[PDB]
Amino acid sequence: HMAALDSLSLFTSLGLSEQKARETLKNSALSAQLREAATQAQQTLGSTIDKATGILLHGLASRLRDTRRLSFLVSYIASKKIHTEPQLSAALEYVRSHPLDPIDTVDFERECGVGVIVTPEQIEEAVEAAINRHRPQLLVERYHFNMGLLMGEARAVLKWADGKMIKNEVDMQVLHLLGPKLETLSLMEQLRGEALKFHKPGENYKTPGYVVTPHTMNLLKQHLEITGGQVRTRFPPEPNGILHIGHAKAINFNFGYAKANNGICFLRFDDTNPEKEEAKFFTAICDMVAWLGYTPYKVTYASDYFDQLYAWAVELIRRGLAYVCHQRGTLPSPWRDRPMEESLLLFEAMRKGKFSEGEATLRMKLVMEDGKMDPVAYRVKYTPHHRTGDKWCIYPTYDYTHCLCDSIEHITHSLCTKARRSSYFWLCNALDVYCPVQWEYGRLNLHYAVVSKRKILQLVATGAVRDWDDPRLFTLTALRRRGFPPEAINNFCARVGVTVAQTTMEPHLLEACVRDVLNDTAPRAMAVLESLRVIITNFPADIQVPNFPADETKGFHQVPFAPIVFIERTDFKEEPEGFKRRHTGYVIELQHVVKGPSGCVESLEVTCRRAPKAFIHWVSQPLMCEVRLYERLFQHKNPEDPTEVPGGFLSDLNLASLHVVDAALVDCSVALAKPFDKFQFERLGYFSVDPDSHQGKLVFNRTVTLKED
């Protein structure tokens, strides 16, 4: 057992510093009581004892004067019910009073936060507030400020929070403020660092391929001064870009890996190219990231660093590892061995705009894994930049940029899709700057989509699709418009995600996942498109329909009671072929059947067979509501790109697409509905609200059916 160890080895087994366990022996009473509290700890814990639990049992033994209740308090500390110093400071005083031993648990449990949970977010906020409330004293005193006050204010807002975990939140938020002291399984478990064989911060040198300069060890030391050894990771789209289903992996894998490991994640916009702002798209990205549930620590642009980048470029030239070249459109350069002072001149000259676009170039002097020669660092572009305007007329290339930017931001894990990889390390080592580690997930793609913004922006100009928002597509903004719940997409990658390689999937698998949650997260109602009036032999003359069939704990809807209800022209037949032709009330037998010109069936008539087999869906006093039902955009599920022989990218287009509705009869339960808050028609399946629906002229998108087969 544990009740069989020398007092000193028991006390270290509860995780006390020996020098504290030495001190503790001397106290023959504390010692002999702690010891007992530890025996009957695991007489009811059945195992070896957690070291976190340890400092509590020590705390308990050292303060509890009322020996009688020791058996009682241990039991609450053993079954982690009590697990923090204020909880125990509380229960201890609860027992300094309440001397009589009925000791109602409930009164007790309530006044010691036995059930309480305290989310990180709540601590973030409590310290964030605390800091703000002192921000300018804290910026001037810096590390000579009284960090005690920050913990204090933080405390008195979170009574039962782990005193340590507050400090950690303080230590960090302060660091970000002041800078360096320059003296199928689960998801956030799937993405935990130790569950992936990802390197721990500050230990880049353990990863495969990592080069170690005589600086690396001091560069990592600085790194660690600057980040406190936090997981830092990026996500780097173009500002005028379009996000598509694939990026849901990118996003999740970057913000996820941070969120899963107390990390932080920059959203860094790759704006190295001077374009104009198609604002439609830029905002679409900040949204879509939020919409999938993540909050960027900070939003940076690469333009933010043109200064630093340029300066480093110059430092490449000095190390004779880059040069200015005058070629055009890999044939070797006459200019790669030109002297350093010459490249220095013309780079500056290139900056002062003495060279027309492409009359000159800065190339890095090397040959890469795949035999590519002297890739280009800096080109000359004269279009004005969206953020630095016309300050610069030379700009870094992607290769050069999103490698050094990772160094400037001390990215710890630079994640990217799957080529010539160790050309990554090349820069950061040539300049002896901190050097992040690159791991590569691979390439999620789905069978039936075209996502090249080029090819997409001409499905919107060739009226094949309504907008870049169009549900037909797989742009995130589109699936959002099809009312796909974020949680689904996030669960999607949960079931099928690691760094696989170009594991491009077939769509229906996703919509398994979209529905598994729409089944629980979307209430129900009724409606049909091919409608028909149904009069009837008189009835009694407000029925009441379910929220969620499988469980009623949610509180049912409000329907109306009228005898002229409507129903689908696709349930009522003349000659049964057994198909049929209610969801609430009676049966209502067909007495009279109409007709008009032709064989058109103008109306109907029903009996009162209230009180077998096919029931149905129906709607009295209905609301007039547009609906769009969509069919797959591209005929060839397989890559619509010349993969097989289509010979056309705009050729494999099933001209079907979408079929407009009536403005059909719909249930009144779905009246106070804003966009995107989809529920279920018990008929065909799941639809969702389009952003065209006012309170009056409502509209819906057919999201997904109820099976496949």
Coil, helix or strand for 217?
Answer: helix
Nearest-CA neighbor of 318 among 354, 343, 300? Answer: 343
Q: Is 163 annotated as a binding residue?
A: no
Q: Is 248 annotated as a binding residue?
A: yes
Cα separations in angstroms, 1 against 7, 51, 58: 13, 16, 18
Q: Is 432 annotated as a binding residue?
A: no
DSSP state letters, 4-47: TS-HHHHHHTTT--HHHHHHHHH-TTHHHHHHHHHHTTTTSS-S
Q: Is 240 annotated as a binding residue?
A: yes
Q: Is 586 annotated as a binding residue?
A: no
Tokens representing 376 are: 């280009």
Q: Give the active site residue among 387, 453, 569, 637.
A: 453
Active site annotation includes 238: yes
Strands (E), 296-408: 298-301, 322-325, 361-364, 376-380, 394-396
Nearest-CA neighbor of 364 among 385, 354, 379? Answer: 379
Q: Is 488 annotated as a binding residue?
A: no
Query: CA-to-CA distance for 271 and 395, rounded, in angstroms?
Result: 10
Coil, helix or strand for 266?
Answer: strand
Q: Is 453 annotated as a binding residue?
A: yes
The answer to whether the beta carbons of residues 242 and 468 sit under 8 Å apart is: yes
Nearest-CA neighbor of 479 among 680, 317, 678, 191? Answer: 678
Q: Give the active site residue among 81, 142, 167, 443.
A: 443
Tokens representing 535 are: 């009069």
The answer to whether the beta carbons of residues 237 and 269 sit under 8 Å apart is: yes
Classify the C-alpha dihedral 308-314-318-320 as positive or negative: positive
Residues ≥6 apart with Cβ < 8 Å to 371: none
The answer to whether the beta carbons of residues 479 and 489 sit under 8 Å apart is: yes
Query: CA-to-CA distance for 182 and 197, rounded, in angstroms?
Result: 32
Q: Is 452 annotated as a binding residue?
A: yes
Residues ≥6 apart with Cβ < 8 Å to 83: 52, 53, 56, 77, 162
Resolution in A: 3.3
Coil, helix or strand for 516?
Answer: helix
Active site annotation includes 443: yes
Query: CA-to-CA distance for 131 and 154, rounded, in angstroms?
Result: 9
Tell me the β-bridge partners of 300: 268
The answer to whether the beta carbons of residues 605 and 591 sit under 8 Å apart is: yes
Q: Is 443 annotated as a binding residue?
A: yes
The answer to whether the beta carbons of residues 174 and 228 sit under 8 Å apart is: no
Residues ≥6 apart with Cβ < 8 Å to 216: 204, 205, 435
Coil, helix or strand for 398?
Answer: helix
Q: Is 244 annotated as a binding residue?
A: yes
322-325 and 298-301 as β-strands: parallel, antiparallel, unpaired?
A: unpaired
Classify the C-alpha dihedral 78-81-85-89 as positive or negative: negative
Query: CA-to-CA distance for 486 and 477, rounded, in angstroms?
Result: 11
Cβ neighbour number for residue 601 with a 10 Å cutoff: 15
Query: CA-to-CA distance for 437 and 425, rounded, in angstroms?
Result: 8
Q: Is 90 annotated as a binding residue?
A: no
Q: Give the active site residue among 238, 275, 278, 626.
A: 238
Q: Is 319 annotated as a binding residue?
A: no
Nearest-CA neighbor of 105 among 84, 82, 121, 134? Answer: 82
- What per-residue string of b and e applies to 625-646 under the rule 16 or more CB within 10 Å gives b? bbbbbbeebbebeebbeeeeeb
Angle at 507 (CA atoms; ends 504, 511), nearest 5 degrees: 135
The residue type at 55: I
The answer to whether the beta carbons of residues 301 and 387 sit under 8 Å apart is: yes
Query: CA-to-CA distance for 254 and 248, rounded, in angstroms?
Result: 10
Classify the C-alpha dihedral 40-46-47-52 as positive or negative: negative
The backbone region for 157, taken as left when phi is positive above 0, alpha when psi lies in -120 to 50, beta otherwise, is alpha
Query: CA-to-CA distance for 18 and 28, rounded, in angstroms?
Result: 16
- What per-residue string of b and e applies to 50-61 under the rule 16 or more CB within 10 Å gives b? beebbebbbbbb
Coil, helix or strand for 688?
Answer: strand
264-269 and 232-235 as β-strands: parallel, antiparallel, unpaired?
A: parallel
Query: CA-to-CA distance for 524 and 663, rounded, in angstroms?
Result: 19
Q: Is 249 annotated as a binding residue?
A: yes
Active site annotation includes 365: no
Query: CA-to-CA distance for 74 and 82, rounded, in angstroms?
Result: 9
Q: Is 617 annotated as a binding residue?
A: no
Q: What is the 3-state secondary structure (H, E, C) of 521-578?
A: HCCEECEECCEEECEECCCCCCCCCCCCCCCCCCCCCCCCCCCCCEEECCCCCCCCCC
Query: CA-to-CA distance for 666 and 699, rounded, in angstroms?
Result: 10
Q: Where are the alpha helices (DSSP H) in 413-522?
A: 424-430, 453-456, 476-481, 486-495, 508-521
Long-range contacts at 460-464 (CB < 8 A, ≥ 24 apart): 462/650, 464/650, 464/653, 464/657
Q: Calculate helix-pair angle for 147-155, 163-178, nearest 10 degrees.
A: 130
Cα separations in angstroms, 103 against 113, 276, 563, 645: 16, 71, 62, 80
Query: CA-to-CA distance for 427 and 400, rounded, in angstroms?
Result: 8
Q: What does residue 81 show for φ and ψ, rounded to 5 degrees?
A: -140, -45
For residues 678, 680, 683 and 686, what is the CA-based torsion angle, rounded to 10 degrees? 50
Q: Is 417 annotated as a binding residue?
A: yes
Cα atoms in the 13 Å half-sphere on the side-chain side of 1: 13
Q: What is the 3-state secondary structure (H, E, C) of 67-103?
A: HHHHHHHHHHHHCCCCCCHHHHHHHHHHHHCCCCCCC
Query: CA-to-CA distance for 533 and 536, rounded, in angstroms?
Result: 10
Q: What does residue 154 show for φ and ψ, rounded to 5 degrees?
A: -70, -35
Euclidean distance between the first and final Cα of the chain, in Å?
59
Query: CA-to-CA distance for 80 and 76, rounded, in angstroms?
Result: 6
